[PDB]
Design a protein around this ligand. Structure first.
Ligand SMILES: Nc1ncnc2c1ncn2[C@@H]1O[C@H](COP(=O)(O)OP(=O)(O)O)[C@@H](O)[C@H]1O
Ligand SMILES: Nc1ncnc2c1ncn2[C@@H]1O[C@H](COP(=O)(O)OP(=O)(O)O)[C@@H](O)[C@H]1O
Ligand SMILES: [Mg+2]
Lengths: 87, 445, 438, 27, 126
């Protein structure tokens, strides 16, 4: 024997009707084919801290979303100041 | 559509409900007997019970033969196929003339297919097997249904489906939050991407994120598709979409019309009959219009006998402005319309007469109305006098140059002086022929 | 609803209308008159049905509208679908893809059918229960079990891997009436004995059921495969030939291939594997063939695989195409010596009236006796085809005025509206200068 | 708009290597 | 009129051909993108690497390479027939592309006649 998936089609009274069944030998296969995943979560609409417009970009160095070149320059200036201060 | 062509004013045959032809209606003037005969032919086409019937429109040039055929086409409507064709088109470098004629015959026979497409749309919210409290065989878990939850803009429904769909779901890699559609007539699951509400502005996928479907989860509609027998023939002779080496060769090689065999056409006929019997399709026999039939050679004329004798052929309308001309492909054989008497015995001849000056003036006025041109009464009378000599086409072709000349002169209507100047600027066939004859030495050949 | 086949020129012809002694009835199966020509056609038809003499040629010659094509269609309808009947026009052999001799050869070989008859074991029953066990992960041997039922039997079958794959591909469920061929393993579903479970969704409207098959499960049935010589030639010419069976584009088939196929078919016939079903090739308007095509016909009729050739022509002493030689029927005398000629006499008044009556019956048109007399007079004066067309024209005119029977007034109306060749030629002579050339 | 010039090419070739890219910082 | 992304590639990281990140920059901007399966496959097919200046169509995802940026380490002695060095684009990473061209009906017919019908617009084997 072994881990198998059994496909079954029957004739049953309703004068007769057809029904199909699928049998999983082990619960691991059943979980793999049917993970019962929960519904996904809606991502939070990030906003640019500088211009408060809806975010469209994401500076990789600072991980701070932004939506304007001026916002990017301000963010990079702030990061440079942070590096200078903290060291 | 916005541009005005030569038969842009022909909106049909101006026939009363009793079939009598009104003097001026639907853009047509005069030709009452020919219009009545064409109305009878329209009724014949609509009856859909005759095959291979032929009609020849015979008359001098510029007498409305093409206009009458287009009026017939307008009367039938866009539902009925209408395949225009000139006789010169049978001469092809790829297929034989008889094949061109047969293809146009099959182009004239249309088929209308009506089907209902039932689909279930939605974003997958739930994917839950329906286990059975008594597992078959004692061990493991058995499932009797798979509950799929579909969410749309204006609803949410749950569908208890066959267990066999679990394989299609896994093959399509369908998970929660994905937008899928399931077809009832096939029982298959197709994943049309993931919902866009789960996409962020930082994602770069192109065809992965799709909007949430509008409307109801269960969508069913009636699909009306109009096809012709030639469409099926061509799609089966040079099929497109296969993944075998022959389809790849077809894609690589230059497309070329081929001589479709009677075997394929018989198979298509059988399939069409099967569809008609099932109620899926309704046959729409249309019209093949062969203008300038005199350009066909003796081989085409001989083939037309067998073509018209068929029980699948459409109703063919011919047109010829020739007199006792010599049949093409023959050496010094003359026939009344350039057509051998054997084919003339198989056609009904509709005669088109010449136009009186009043009818010419009416047609000129109609053409001026169609072209958006305001013409004064004196200018109209002068142009009709110009049309009494020369021809009608010359007069209707002087309308737009005269309108342009008036607009340049700063007038919103054509006066007589504009028509006189245009007549001076442009010559007709007879005046040019007189000039050529008067100076035959100075010209070439 | 209207089928793809509608009322045509020869839609009323259902056969030659002969008795056992091949004596033509005056009016039977659509044919009227032409007694001698119909008797000759019946003799030729008996010769075709016997199928013993190869390469016989018959020429149907007569004036236009005398029933040459009507006789050919009657012969075709009397033969039946079992015997091949290739009808072509003379113009069809002029092709840019193949030579004239190649086209004529293909026409000949489309008129000979090769039939292969074999007995195979067939399982036909109602599926009661199907179980298929497959490994959960990785390559493995699927194991399955199938139960089939008839009215008097029920057997449980142990399934092999390839039959398991076939059943999976066909998606065979319980209640499906399936056919299994043991050798090839092909499975054809032909219906459902009952509905599927109602609780399922997205299933569609259930169609009608099919009664369960009776008798034994594994029967023995006779399978008949019939192809023509042309189809064999095409599918053997090249690998892509089967597509050439539908697209044309066969080019010119090598003579070696045809010789091999002739040898193999003769071997099959001697071995009792296949039977040859010779048919008819009908070339309408054979006068369009040129001298080279006729010369090829001369010797191509001398083969034992040649069918019966039937030609129709309405030519008198006419120039042969491609030459400057005048010959009877437009046919060279060498070919005219190899063929029997069947003459068609013109129709009388009563024969014309009976033909008009048959046409009206075919078109579901009701006509008065006076209208029949007037139409017969017109047909005698002008032509038979003009009267046939006026039948439908007058039917439409009568229906327009909310009538039920075609009267003399309707016939006169359509006679005024639609012209014959004679009146059209007269009116063109009246305005000769208005028409373009001559 | 973005064709290179000889001046830019020479400046880039002569200039030293750019400073190493800073590591990402979750801020 | 088409919306496009235009920038120079800084880093391409792919975890395992399942999910990855792409970093693009201009002279005034820089951002990181999350890639899917088809985007990763398209990037690997075109062999996009660091220093390449590319444009990506938002609607269709097709990637065409404009050029590569010049660095001190890219002083090649021999260059391929298609490589060319371009300046890093300026402005904003998201751009709109407007293309106006005049074609004839015959050209559209030849384009749609066969799979690669535009070749017949050069050869004439229509
Ligand atoms: N009786 C008519 N009423 C209105 N317009 C007409 C009439 N006869 C011809 N025309 C117009 O005059 C032009 C002459 O062309 P036409 O007569 O159709 O050529 P042909 O005689 O070869 O068919 C056409 O553009 C047609 O629209
Ligand atoms: N003897 C006949 N019996 C019945 N119908 C006939 C007869 N002769 C001719 N017809 C009909 O008259 C029409 C024209 O005859 P056809 O056979 O085409 O003449 P041809 O011999 O010149 O081909 C055909 O539709 C045919 O059905
Ligand atoms: Mg005939």
């Amino acid at each position: 024997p072994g881990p198998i998936i059994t496909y079954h089609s029957v004739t049953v009274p309703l004068a007769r009707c057809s029904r199909t069944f699928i049998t999983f030998s082990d619960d691991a296969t059943f979980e793999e084919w049917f993970p019962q995943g929960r519904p996904p979560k809606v991502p939070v609409r990030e906003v640019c801290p500088v211009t408060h417009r809806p975010a469209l970009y994401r500076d990789p160095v600072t991980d701070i979303p932004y939506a304007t070149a001026r916002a990017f320059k301000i963010i990079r200036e702030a990061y440079k100041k942070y590096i200078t201060a903290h060291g | 559509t916005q541009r005005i062509a030569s038969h842009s004013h022909v909106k049909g045959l101006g026939l009363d409900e009793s079939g009598l032809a009104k003097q001026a209606a639907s853009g047509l003037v005069g030709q009452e007997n020919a219009r009545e005969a064409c109305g009878v032919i329209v009724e014949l086409i609509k009856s859909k019970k005759m095959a291979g019937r032929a009609v020849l429109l015979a008359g001098p040039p510029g007498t409305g033969k093409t206009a009458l055929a287009l009026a017939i086409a307008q009367e039938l409507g866009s539902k009925v196929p209408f395949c225009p064709m000139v006789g010169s088109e049978v001469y092809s470098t790829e297929i034989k003339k008889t094949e061109v004629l047969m293809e146009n015959f099959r182009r004239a026979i249309g088929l209308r297919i009506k089907e209902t497409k039932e689909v279930y749309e939605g974003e997958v919210t739930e994917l839950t097997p329906c286990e059975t409290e008594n597992p078959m065989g004692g061990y493991g878990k058995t499932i009797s249904h798979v509950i799929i939850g579909l969410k749309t803009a204006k609803g949410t429904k749950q569908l208890k489906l066959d267990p066999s769909i679990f394989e299609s779901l896994q093959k399509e890699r369908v998970e929660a939050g994905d937008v899928i559609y399931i077809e009832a007539n096939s029982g298959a699951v197709k994943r049309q991407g993931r919902c866009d509400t789960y996409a962020t502005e930082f994602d770069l996928e192109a065809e992965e994120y799709v909007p949430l479907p509008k409307g109801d989860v269960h969508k069913k509609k009636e699909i009306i598709q109009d096809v012709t027998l030639h469409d099926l023939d061509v799609a089966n002779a040079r099929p497109q979409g296969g993944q075998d080496i022959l389809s790849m060769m077809g894609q690589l090689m230059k497309p070329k019309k081929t001589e479709i065999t009677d075997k394929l056409r018989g198979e298509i006929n059988k399939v069409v009959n099967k569809y008609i019997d099932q109620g899926i399709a309704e046959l729409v026999p249309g019209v093949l219009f062969v203008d300038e039939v005199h350009m066909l050679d003796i081989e085409c004329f001989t083939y037309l006998h067998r073509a018209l004798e068929s029980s699948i052929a459409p109703i063919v309308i011919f047109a010829s402005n020739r007199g006792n001309c010599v049949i093409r492909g023959t050496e010094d054989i003359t026939s009344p319309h350039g057509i051998p008497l054997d084919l003339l015995d198989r056609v009904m001849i509709i005669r088109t007469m010449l136009y009186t000056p009043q009818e010419m003036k009416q047609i000129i006025k109609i053409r001026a109305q169609t072209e958006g041109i305001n013409i004064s009464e004196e200018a109209l009378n002068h142009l009709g006098e110009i049309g009494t000599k020369t021809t009608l086409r010359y007069s209707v072709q002087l309308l737009t140059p005269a309108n342009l000349l008036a607009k340049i002169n700063g007038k919103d209507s054509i006066e007589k002086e504009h028509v006189e100047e245009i007549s001076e600027l442009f010559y007709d066939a007879k005046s040019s022929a007189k000039i050529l004859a008067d100076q035959q030495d100075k010209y070439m050949k | 609803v209207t089928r793809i086949e509608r009322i045509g020129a020869h839609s009323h012809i259902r056969g030659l209308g002969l008795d056992d002694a091949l004596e033509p009835r005056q009016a039977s199966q659509g044919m009227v008159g032409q007694l001698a020509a119909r008797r000759a056609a019946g003799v030729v038809l008996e010769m075709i049905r016997e199928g013993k003499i190869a390469g016989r040629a018959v020429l149907i010659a007569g004036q236009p509208g005398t029933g040459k094509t009507a006789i050919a269609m009657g012969m075709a309808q009397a033969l039946g679908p079992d015997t091949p009947f290739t009808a072509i026009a003379g113009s069809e052999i002029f092709s840019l893809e193949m030579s004239k001799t190649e086209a004529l050869t293909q026409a000949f070989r489309r008129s000979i059918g090769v039939r292969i008859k074999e007995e195979t074991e067939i399982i036909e029953g109602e599926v009661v229960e199907i179980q298929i066990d497959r490994p959960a992960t990785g390559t493995g041997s699927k194991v399955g079990k199938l139960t089939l039922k008839t009215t008097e039997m029920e057997t449980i079958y142990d399934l092999g891997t390839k039959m398991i794959e076939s059943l999976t591909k066909d998606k065979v469920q319980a209640g499906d009436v399936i056919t299994i061929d043991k050798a090839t393993g092909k499975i054809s579903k032909l219906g459902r004995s009952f509905t599927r479970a109602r609780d399922y969704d997205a299933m569609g409207s259930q169609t009608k059921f099919v009664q369960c098959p009776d008798g034994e499960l594994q029967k023995r049935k006779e399978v008949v495969h019939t192809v023509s010589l042309h189809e064999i030639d095409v599918i053997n010419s090249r690998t892509q030939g089967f597509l050439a069976l539908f697209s044309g584009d066969t080019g010119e088939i090598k003579s070696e291939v045809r010789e091999q196929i002739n040898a193999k078919v003769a071997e099959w016939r001697e071995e009792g594997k296949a039977e040859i079903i010779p048919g008819v090739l009908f070339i309408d308007e054979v006068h369009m063939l040129d001298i080279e095509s006729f010369s090829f016909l001369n010797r191509a009729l001398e083969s034992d695989m040649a069918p019966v050739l039937i030609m129709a022509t309405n030519r008198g002493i006419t120039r042969i195409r491609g030459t400057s030689y005048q010959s009877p029927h437009g046919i060279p005398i060498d070919l005219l010596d190899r063929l029997l000629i069947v003459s068609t006499t013109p129709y009388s008044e009563k024969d014309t009236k009976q033909i008009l009556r048959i046409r009206c019956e075919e078109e579901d048109v009701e006509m008065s006796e006076d209208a029949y007399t007037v139409l017969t007079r017109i047909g005698l004066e002008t032509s038979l085809r003009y009267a046939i067309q006026l039948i439908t024209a007058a039917s439409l005119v009568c229906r327009k005025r909310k009538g039920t029977e075609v009267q003399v007034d309707d016939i006169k109306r359509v006679y005024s509206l639609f012209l014959d060749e004679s009146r059209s030629t007269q009116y063109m002579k009246e305005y000769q200068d208005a028409f373009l050339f001559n | 708009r973005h064709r290179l010039s000889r001046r830019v090419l020479l400046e880039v070739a002569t200039a030293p290597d750019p400073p190493p890219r800073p590591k990402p910082v979750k801020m």
